[PDB]
A paper describes a structure:
The heterotrimeric [[name]] hydrogenase, HydABC, from [name] is a soluble cytoplasmic enzyme involved in fermentation. It uses electrons from the one-electron carrier ferredoxin (E°′ ≈ −450 mV Schut and Adams, 2009), which is reduced during pyruvate metabolism, and the two-electron carrier NADH (E°′ ≈ −20 mV; Schut and Adams, 2009), produced during glucose metabolism, to reduce protons to hydrogen (E°′ ≈ −420 mV; Schut and Adams, 2009). The electron-bifurcating [[name]] hydrogenase from [name] (HydABC) requires both NADH and ferredoxin to reduce protons generating hydrogen. Electron bifurcation is a fundamental energy conservation mechanism in nature in which two electrons from an intermediate-potential electron donor are split so that one is sent along a high-potential pathway to a high-potential acceptor and the other is sent along a low-potential pathway to a low-potential acceptor.
Following grid imaging, data collection, and processing, we obtained a 2.3-Å resolution map when D2 symmetry was enforced. The processed cryo-EM map shows that HydABC forms a dodecameric complex, Hyd(ABC)4, composed of a tetramer of HydABC heterotrimer units (from now on referred to as protomers). Oligomerization of HydABC occurs through interactions between four [name] subunits in the core of the complex. The [name] core is the best resolved part of the map, consistent with the core being rigid and homogenous. Initially, the last 91 and 61 CT residues of [name] and [name], respectively, could not be built as they were not present in the homology model (because complex I does not contain homologous domains) and had a low resolution in the map, indicating regions of high heterogeneity (explored later). The two tightly interacting HydABC protomers within the Hyd(ABC)2 unit are connected (8.8 Å separation) through the His-ligated [4Fe–4S] cluster (A4) in [name], part of the so-called Y-junction of iron–sulfur clusters. Within the Hyd(ABC)4 complex, there appear to be two redox networks, each composed of two HydABC protomers with an extended electron transfer chain, separated by at least 50 Å and held together by extensive [name]–[name] interactions.
Numbering used by the authors:
A (entry chain B): 1 to 57, 70 to 567
B (entry chain A): 1 to 554
C (entry chain C): 4 to 159
């Protein structure tokens, strides 16, 4: 594990045997990802640990990542028999311990209800929600360990890195990624292999590898979920990339307002360094690679490539005209490779199998799966994962349980402010980088939000423009001034002081902002206006007349 | 190189950075608000839009290729340009009548040409910052956030006291915490003003004080700086003329100035005193290297940045303060009128001289400092045809100077004048001049009786930091804050760029060429002043010497 | 006169590309970025204060005013906003009397709206000194603030 792969395999097999014995023996797995700790999961962990200390009971109490049922309260899984309770409160630790840890009686009250069948399913694998999802990146749901490199190694971890370092060569890793058809999951969809090729052939002896930990959407939390769950999968993907493009240093840019993800990634970097998977030499192959965590002080624009690099260098996150691209001159002018955290997560999975197995999921042009975060009023919400051929109906109903009583589908947001608003018509079209791209929409970063009939679409566009005007870097006139002017017009709309000349001004200004803006933030700033006007123009007309079709606008 | 513009064959240069510049060099202009000064960069205005391959993009970031077909003017581009200009104007403080840039503003010209007659958008309120604490005046309500001033202050002046702050609609160029400029490390060089394309940065106007003084019964005395006369013809769009200063004398007497003196006489005085101070320092190897103290922007910069070199500064005051002290403490007595009766006006190319006149060590010597632009405003207000004014000389006894004193107006002048005085007293065998870089000149000087030394001329603050970090073999260093020296001062006519500054230097050189006095000691009036009123060391120290103190905030 | 600041700077070596991390640690220590501290950082690192001010005013984490004793953070992501976050903001405004980005003159409260906290299932959410909420309403938030104030009055 330190200086060669034979010792690595020995250590890995030892850890596998220990992990299997832990699977057999009694254990507690408390989900600690965001959303579970927002319903009191930390208190549940404290209660379980204190009770075990007081009762003198080799049970391996553990921390696990998000299990995809964030709406189901704090979640606890029992290892020998996957019982996977839900809504577990810190006032119920004695009963759960004394009825399940020792006696083994299933507690029907704390199990997971099924919104479609309305029954307390005992296991999650048997639940329809799990079955309809196509897990490829979320592995060991509820029976995983986030804060430990030993568990990740026991789960066949870093052996892809071993294979890359010792078996195959940079060029072949890149060619494999090219034939795998992995496209950037950060929203752009650019083929990852071509980007890696650009960075590789680019002139220079020093390169860098940057992971964009930003969600790209103020309402989405799936990249954060990935960072909190398996920081070592991201780490492995980045190290593989650094080897492939011949980079010696890499940066993980994570917002400082996500303290848990930053702590987990820092701990993972420390653990990988300790074992020698990072440092002056790895596996004795002469390839050195050190990785660092760059905390973000918070700016939506910093999700942009050039602004990201500017913020990494310690300056204002202000973008610049794209050419030269960062693949040729990025950090300090050295060639740089920037990918989303999801892309790096897909790298080790792809290298684990062949291109043939990886391509069996998705469509001919969109292989693999995608992680989404679902919010808004639904029976089930949270982080999901589906094949790249899934329609919005499939998610919204079979994978999220549908709407809560008294609510019906009106619209859906797919990329947040930069994404598109879709009406009922666009529900029967599979998610795909080509179907929606040419159909005036996109899959986006991963965040999904359902809009019910109780919401006014003018208000939605106003909210997104308010966000855009706050987040604009202020460098160029179209974005800086136009987003503010458009927000002003939208506010006049929501206050009953709007006329038709205002609507014409909004449309023309939207075209100008979309075309003339320097960077992607400004270019997609008017997307909500254009989409809502295409699909819900009658709502704007109604606001002009003097009455909100729904009832949330104050007048 | 063959390209098609609006369906027309155009030949451009084979190697060009972007389409916009190539078309400009071939005579085709694309409207834009990025190219505004020599410190400009492309990409912010977004008005340079062209259509190539049916897609619209900025021509400032488009590399031309053979056979490219570009439409520079389409209805879509028309609408986008008009929208962007309207966006700028909607939140612009539109008060051109009281704006310093009125008449020479690109934004005002575009508003005229684009037929903008109603603000379609809303003049949404911005938290504007107005600052009038310094001779450099800030008003962010006029700023178009071009960033030229930030680059000038950081990269050219090496101060960097102004920066982009906040973001989005509230983006603003400002000092740290919106501190008043007079309380910062700003050296008041006015270079940001020289480069600003709007009225956001301007020079404090003091014409009303001059009118008040001229209307009263006190004796108004004017003194004109060397570099004022080499640049003021630009305001009137007329060719240079070495007789400019004497036309100014005639004009000033016409509007009621009692006396007009030549500050270049003060330059002769300062060079004469500084040469002796430097020679004493060289003889006793004390307080070296010597820094010239004639540039007040450099002096303030040193007080902020090099408190260890404050003793190394020349103790002799600048020509303005030296001549002004002479006028107030010697000439007033020789005239039989109390010093309180004299109102002393200084006409300068420099905003830092306004600060210097108001310094505590100089309080009450120079009553007001007016820049070349303010003097041009006086002339234009009169409507007098300055080019037809009959010249008359400066008034005695401070109206004559050597060519060396007049040479102060451009970088290297004071060093040349010091060398001239040293040569006339202790001859100089040879001088070996070297140019390590663009604005640095290093000269080796060997006197007759040995004791050679090296002196450097540095123009443009910001070069100073690196030069002082790498050269310990120089004994005297001349520092001018503004590139090319005072011909490129902050108070000079706008536009104030490299080519114009070079032309001003040529004008000053031609003016120096017609002078018959070669060195300060050939100035009989200067010698008489020294012989009559500056005899003892105590009087000379009181009259021509000043002190410096460290500058820090807490 | 700033020991902890000197230690942070030495830890990062007064290096420019560590300015963001330095500022975050300073903010954690002082709860904001005071002008004196920014002046000290500018002097020690050889960076003019205007540049540091430009950085500090660009990113959402940094605050130029002291944080409140009870720092109120209300999510304004898509889910929370469609679920009534503006109502929570208005109720906080009408009870405590402060717009987002402000601190009460008595330094007891401070408001700031942040992005999705990763708890959309409880939309709208709101955090006071790290303790989260859910399914909030105007009456509920008024109740929370009233009871926090009442508790603050038993120790006077
Ligand atoms: C305002 C803005 C925010 C963005 N945020 C992200 C982000 O958080 N994560 C990401 O991967 N890409 C983001 N992008 C897209 C990046 O510019 C870039 O395409 C991406 O980081 C490349 O990674 P990929 O290979 O996963 O596509 C953002 C773009 C813009 C204009
Ligand atoms: S579009 Fe907006 S974010 Fe992008 S450079 Fe222009 S002002 Fe900045
Ligand atoms: S900068 Fe001055 S002259 Fe130009 S448009 Fe603005 S107010 Fe008018
Ligand atoms: S006067 Fe000189 S030092 Fe002061 S802000 Fe302008 S350019 Fe910078
Ligand atoms: S002050 Fe003048 S030069 Fe500086 S950014 Fe504003 S308009 Fe441009
Ligand atoms: S170089 Fe001349 S114009 Fe410029 S600040 Fe110095 S004295 Fe004034
Ligand atoms: S954080 Fe626990 S299931 Fe998502
Ligand atoms: S010239 Fe200003 S953006 Fe092109
Ligand atoms: S949108 Fe508020 S917690 Fe996600
Ligand atoms: Zn409405």
């Amino acid at each position: 594990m330190f200086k060669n792969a034979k010792e690595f395999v020995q250590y890995a097999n030892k850890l596998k045997t220990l992990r299997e014995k832990k699977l057999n023996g009694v254990s507690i797995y408390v989900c600690v990802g965001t959303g579970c700790t927002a319903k009191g999961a930390l208190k549940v962990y404290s209660a379980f640990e204190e009770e075990l200390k007081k009762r003198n009971l080799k049970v391996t109490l553990n921390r696990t990542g998000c299990c995809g049922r964030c709406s189901s309260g704090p979640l606890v899984k029992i290892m020998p028999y996957r019982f996977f309770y839900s809504n577990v409160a810190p006032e119920d630790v004695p009963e759960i311990v004394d009825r399940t840890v020792l006696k083994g009686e299933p507690i029907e009250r704390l199990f997971l209800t099924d919104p479609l069948t309305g029954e307390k399913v005992p296991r999650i694998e048997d639940t329809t929600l799990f079955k309809n999802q196509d897990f490829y990146i979320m592995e060991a749901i509820g029976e995983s360990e986030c804060d430990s490199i030993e568990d990740y190694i026991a789960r066949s971890g870093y052996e892809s890195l071993v294979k890359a370092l010792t078996s195959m060569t940079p060029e072949e890793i890149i060619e494999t990624v090219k034939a795998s058809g992995l496209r950037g999951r950060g929203g752009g969809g650019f083929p990852t292999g071509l980007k890696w090729e650009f960075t590789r052939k680019a002139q220079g002896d020093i390169k860098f590898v940057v992971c964009n930990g930003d969600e790209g959407d103020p309402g989405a939390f799936m990249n954060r979920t990935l960072l909190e769950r398996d920081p070592h999968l991201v780490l492995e993907g980045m190290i593989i990339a650094g080897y492939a493009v011949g980079a010696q240093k890499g940066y993980a840019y994570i917002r400082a307002e996500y303290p848990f993800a930053v702590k987990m990634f820092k701990k993972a970097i420390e653990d990988a360094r300790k074992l020698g998977l990072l440092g002056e030499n790895i596996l004795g192959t002469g390839f050195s690679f050190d990785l660092e965590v760059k905390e973000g002080a918070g700016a939506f624009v910093c999700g942009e490539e050039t602004a990201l690099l500017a913020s990494i260098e310690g300056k204002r996150g202000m973008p610049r005209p794209k050419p030269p691209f960062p693949a040729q001159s990025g950090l300090w002018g050295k060639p740089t490779l920037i990918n989303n955290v999801e892309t790096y997560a897909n790298i080790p999975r792809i290298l684990r199998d062949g291109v043939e197995n990886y391509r069996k999921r998705g469509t001919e042009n969109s292989p693999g799966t995608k992680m989404f975060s679902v919010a808004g009023p639904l029976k089930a919400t949270g982080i999901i994962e589906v094949e790249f051929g899934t329609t919005l109906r499939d998610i919204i109903y079979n994978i999220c349980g549908g709407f809560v009583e008294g609510e019906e589908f009106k619209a859906v947001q797919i990329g947040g402010p930069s994404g598109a608003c879709l009406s009922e018509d666009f529900i029967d079209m599979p998610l795909d980088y080509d179907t929606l791209k040419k159909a005036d929409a996109m899959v986006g970063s991963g965040g999904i939000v359902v809009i019910t009939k109780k919401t006014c679409m003018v208000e939605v566009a106003r909210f997104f423009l308010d966000f855009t005007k706050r987040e604009s870097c202020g460098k160029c006139v179209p974005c800086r001034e136009g987003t503010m002017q458009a927000y002003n017009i939208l506010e006049k709309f929501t206050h009953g002081k709007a006329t038709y000349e205002d609507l014409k001004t909004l449309e023309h200004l939207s075209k100008t902002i979309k075309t003339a803006s320097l960077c992607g933030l400004g270019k997609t700033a008017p997307n909500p206006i254009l989409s809502t006007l295409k699909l819900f123009r009658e709502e704007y007309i109604a606001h002009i007349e003097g009455e909100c079709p729904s009832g949330m606008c104050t007048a | 190189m063959k390209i098609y513009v609006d369906g027309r064959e155009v030949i451009i240069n084979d190697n060009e950075r972007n389409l916009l510049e190539a078309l400009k060099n071939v005579g085709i202009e694309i409207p834009n608000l990025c190219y505004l000064s020599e410190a400009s960069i492309y990409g912010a205005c977004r008005m340079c839009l062209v259509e190539i391959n049916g897609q619209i993009t900025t021509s400032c970031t488009l590399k031309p290729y053979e056979g490219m077909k570009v439409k520079t003017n389409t209805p879509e581009i028309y609408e986008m340009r008009r929208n962007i200009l309207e966006l700028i104007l909607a939140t612009h403080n539109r008060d051109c009548t009281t704006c310093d840039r009125n008449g020479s503003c690109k934004l005002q010209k575009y508003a005229e040409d684009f037929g903008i007659r109603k603000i379609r958008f809303e003049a949404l309120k911005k938290e504007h910052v107005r600052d009038e604490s310094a001779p450099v005046v800030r008003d962010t309500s006029k700023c178009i956030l071009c960033g030229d001033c930030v680059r000038v202050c950081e990269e050219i002046q090496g101060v960097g006291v102004i920066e982009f702050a906040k973001r989005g609609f509230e983006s603003v160029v400002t000092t740290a915490f919106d501190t008043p400029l007079i309380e910062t490390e700003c050296v008041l060089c006015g270079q940001c003003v020289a480069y600003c394309p709007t009225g956001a940065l301007s020079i404090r106007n003091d014409i009303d004080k001059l009118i008040e003084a001229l209307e009263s019964d006190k004796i108004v005395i004017g003194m004109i700086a060397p570099a004022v006369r080499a640049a003021i013809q630009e305001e009137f769009g007329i060719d240079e003329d070495v007789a400019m200063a004497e036309k100014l004398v005639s004009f000033l007497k016409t509007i009621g100035f009692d006396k007009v003196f030549d500050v270049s006489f003060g330059a002769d005085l300062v060079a004469y005193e500084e040469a002796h101070e430097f020679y004493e320092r060289l003889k006793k190897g004390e307080r070296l290297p010597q820094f010239t103290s004639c540039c007040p922007a450099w002096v303030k910069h040193a007080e902020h940045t090099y408190p260890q070199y404050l003793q190394n500064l020349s103790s002799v005051k600048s020509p303005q303060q030296a001549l002004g002290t002479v006028i107030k403490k010697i000439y007033a007595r020789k005239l039989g009128v109390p010093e309180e009766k004299i109102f002393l006006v200084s006409f300068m190319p420099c905003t830092a001289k306004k600060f210097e006149a108001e310094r505590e060590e100089h309080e009450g010597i120079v009553d007001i400092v007016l820049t070349t632009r303010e003097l041009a405003q006086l002339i234009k207000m009169s409507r007098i045809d300055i080019n037809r004014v009959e010249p008359q000389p400066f008034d005695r006894p401070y109206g004559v100077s050597s060519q060396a004193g007049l040479g102060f107006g451009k970088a290297g002048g004071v060093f040349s004048c010091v060398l001239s005085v040293l040569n006339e007293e202790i001859g100089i065998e040879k001088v070996d001049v070297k140019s390590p870089e663009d604005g640095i000149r290093v000269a080796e000087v060997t006197l007759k009786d040995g004791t050679s030394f090296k002196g450097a001329v540095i123009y443009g603050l910001g070069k100073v930091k690196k030069f002082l970090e790498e050269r310990k073999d120089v004994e005297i260093i001349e520092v001018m804050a503004c590139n090319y020296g005072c011909v490129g001062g902050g108070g000079q006519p706008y536009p104030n760029d490299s080519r114009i500054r070079e032309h001003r230097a040529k004008v000053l050189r031609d003016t120096m060429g017609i002078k018959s006095l070669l060195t300060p000691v050939e100035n009989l009036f200067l010698m008489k002043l020294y012989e009559e009123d500056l005899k003892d060391e105590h009087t000379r120290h009181e009259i021509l010497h000043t002190t410096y103190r460290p500058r820090r905030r807490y | 006169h700033f020991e902890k600041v000197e230690e942070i700077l030495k830890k990062y070596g007064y290096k420019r590309e560590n300015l963001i991390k330095i500022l975050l640690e300073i903010q954690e220590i002082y709860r904001y970025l005071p002008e004196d501290v920014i002046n000290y950082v500018s002097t020690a690192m050889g960076i003019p204060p205007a540049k540091i001010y430009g950085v500090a005013t660009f990113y959402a984490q940094f605050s130029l005013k002291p944080k409140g004793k009870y720092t109120i953070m209300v999510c304004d992501g898509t889910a929370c906003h469609m679920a009534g976050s503006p109502e929570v903001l208005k109720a906080i405004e009408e009870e405590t009397g402060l717009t987002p980005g402000n601190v009460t003159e008595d330094l007891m409260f401070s408001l700031d709206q942040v992005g999705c906290l990763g708890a959309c299932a409880l939309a709208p959410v709101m955090v006071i000194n790290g303790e989260v909420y859910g399914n909030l309403t105007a009456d509920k938030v008024k109740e929370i603030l009233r009871k926090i104030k009442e508790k603050e009055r038993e120790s006077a």
